[PDB]
Design a protein around this ligand. Structure first.
Ligand code: SAH
Ligand code: SAH
Ligand code: QOI
Ligand code: QOI
Ligand code: CL
Ligand code: CL
Ligand code: CL
Ligand code: CL
Ligand code: CL
Ligand code: CL
Ligand code: CL
Ligand code: NA
Lengths: 321, 319
């Protein structure tokens, strides 16, 4: 950062902005397999001025997103994933960089000073985050698409550290697309997989039953395994404990509730960033093991075992003692 | 990979530093002082939980330093303590709907190729129309511009002799900081600032004129100055300004252009180049591009000098 870094931190949102335009405009797609593209032909396809697009490239080359040739311009080694529409980088841009996040960020300091029931997001949109998602078809599919990435990364080691082979019926609460169950079903075949979530239009996948309901109401029983993945961190204590009450109220002993979340550690850039995001969007938070035990104890739950899948991701086995 | 996702999410770093400054917490961190988060929260009526979480994030990104005392600004981020710092003024000026909403529109402005800038597509009125309407933004704009002028003065006076001039006009001079600073070191001259005012500014030994440089420019000045004006305008409009400059000038009169020159040894120019496209449908220019618009406006580039790494001086005559 060359001696003085504070200014580079402040202006570096411009780097995000430039990458976002490159993606949003729909130009990132033409840079597949490290191909060198002629900007004029590219500019001529989408009806953009050559000069403006050539200049945007010059900035993307400087920051190291693009690379320069005698004929054309290509994506760099480290930024190849911008060409792939099913990469964590492309989907992060698609979901995160928009009015829903950026205008809520500009409201965040006002929400800190105005201590009330309203989150920074609700102060802007006048609705809940998920209420707004269900009204906007495009963002929900972008939300689910990016969430699908974070399930696929734990799926490999989740099946290793836990025995789903020993569970007759399995219910995923706030599962969206059953990406957790879909990927589990592929490995652990011949079991009852159920997904409960708010669907305006219901999704379907072979061997997955998509229940349509609200987890603030009593949750259907008959399931040996209940699972909450990245759900509790969307809610404060009053709302989160109320969800666990409905899990505890639905679990006959001999049954387990699975909770997978970004467990806050003393020193994690990823979790801390997401934690401020939760506060901004839902007036919620990421939690420590002791915070989970406390909210678990409130409804009336105990942890048989806790262990980490990744550095950031951790698993908590919960039962109605 | 690690690099690409860090570039994408690093807006959160900007966003966090903005919340810190905007909320008014920044002022209590002067002279490397360590603040008790609890009393800081209690003072501002902020929930301790929410603040200490925000603070933790600033400690991870490196803005703050944790201790037994409490928390302080890091040596490299000290400038958030100073409310007339280039860093602090950049936050106040640049991190707001005006810029961020215009950035979100920027891809639309590319595809929907028309005269309307990303900013015009959001606000329905030009950047300067919007700035003249809002006293808060203009004061912030002028405050941050004043900082960028103050850096130039020292070596601007060394390479160009204002002492040999007596009637000097600053075109789009705003608050007239350029003439205010030069007037202090160079006395007994007629210093005039031409801009769009509502209540014309006041300063000793500085004349402030209400004017439009798209209309014929006042004659009888021997030095005209355009500093960070032409990068707000596309070629046709930039030519109209330089054309009004030529027609105002005679021989034995000189025009000074102080812009961020599009020279690869400049770090910040290409980022500001995209900022100008987004805000004005304008750009920073290569020397060859200035040569182009100067010739069309009937001007000649006499000399070209490097003020410093980013800033450049162009001397123009009529011919
Ligand atoms: N009242 C409610 N009842 C049930 N599900 C709800 C709900 N409010 C929000 N949700 C759902 O809670 C989910 C939180 S995001 C987590 C998605 C999924 N568990 C995963 O890990 O990939 C969203 O899919 C949202 O639709
Ligand atoms: N038509 C017009 N006539 C005169 N001044 C104009 C103008 N349109 C814009 N301006 C002014 O041109 C200036 C451009 S910004 C440059 C400010 C100053 N020269 C500096 O270096 O900091 C603004 O102050 C703006 O108000
Ligand atoms: O940004 C993230 C994120 C980033 C990296 C890794 C991640 O796991 C996440 C994640 O899980 C997550 C989330 O669950 C809900 C959000 O609103 C945002 C994020
Ligand atoms: O952002 C900048 C800027 C940044 C760094 C260094 C700079 O010099 C500038 C600058 O001059 C400038 C400007 O003249 C007009 C603007 O709207 C924005 C900027
Ligand atoms: Cl959660
Ligand atoms: Cl989210
Ligand atoms: Cl402040
Ligand atoms: Cl206190
Ligand atoms: Cl006006
Ligand atoms: Cl300029
Ligand atoms: Cl030339
Ligand atoms: Na105006």
């Amino acid at each position: 950062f060359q001696g003085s870094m504070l200014i580079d931190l402040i202006t570096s949102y411009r780097k995000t902005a430039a990458i976002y335009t490159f993606v949003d405009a729909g130009l990132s797609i033409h840079f597949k397999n490290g191909d060198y593209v002629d900007i004029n032909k590219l500019a001529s396809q989408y009806g953009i001025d050559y000069s403006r697009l050539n200049r945007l490239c010059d900035f993307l080359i400087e920051i190291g997103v693009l690379v320069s040739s005698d004929h054309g311009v290509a994506l760099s080694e480290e930024c190849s994933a911008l060409a792939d529409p099913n990469s964590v980088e492309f989907l992060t841009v698609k979901y995160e960089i928009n009015s829903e996040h950026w205008d809520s960020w500009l409201m965040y300091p006002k929400s800190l000073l105005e201590n009330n029931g309203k989150s920074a997001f609700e102060m802007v949109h006048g609705k809940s985050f998920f209420e707004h998602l269900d009204s906007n078809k495009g963002l929900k599919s972008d939300f689910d698409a990016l969430m699908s990435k974070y399930t696929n990364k734990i799926i490999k080691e989740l099946l290793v550290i836990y025995d789903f082979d020993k569970h007759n019926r399995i219910l995923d609460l706030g599962g969206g697309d059953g990406e957790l169950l879909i990927r589990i079903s592929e490995q652990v075949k011949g079991k009852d997989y159920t997904v409960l979530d708010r669907y305006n239009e219901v999704p379907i996948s072979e061997g997955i039953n998509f229940i349509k309901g609200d987890f603030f109401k009593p949750i259907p029983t008959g399931y040996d395994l209940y699972i909450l993945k990245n759900v509790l961190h969307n809610w404060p204590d009053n709302d989160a404990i109320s969800i666990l009450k409905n899990c505890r109220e639905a679990m006959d002993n001999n049954a387990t509730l699975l909770i997978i979340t970004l467990m806050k550690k003393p020193q994690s850039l990823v979790v801390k960033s997401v934690d401020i995001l939760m506060d901004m969007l839902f007036s919620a938070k990421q939690r420590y093991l002791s915070e989970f035990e406390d909210i678990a104890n409130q409804a009336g739950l105990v942890i048989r075992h806790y262990k980490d899948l990744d550095e950031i991701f951790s698993l908590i086995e919960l039962k109605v003692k």
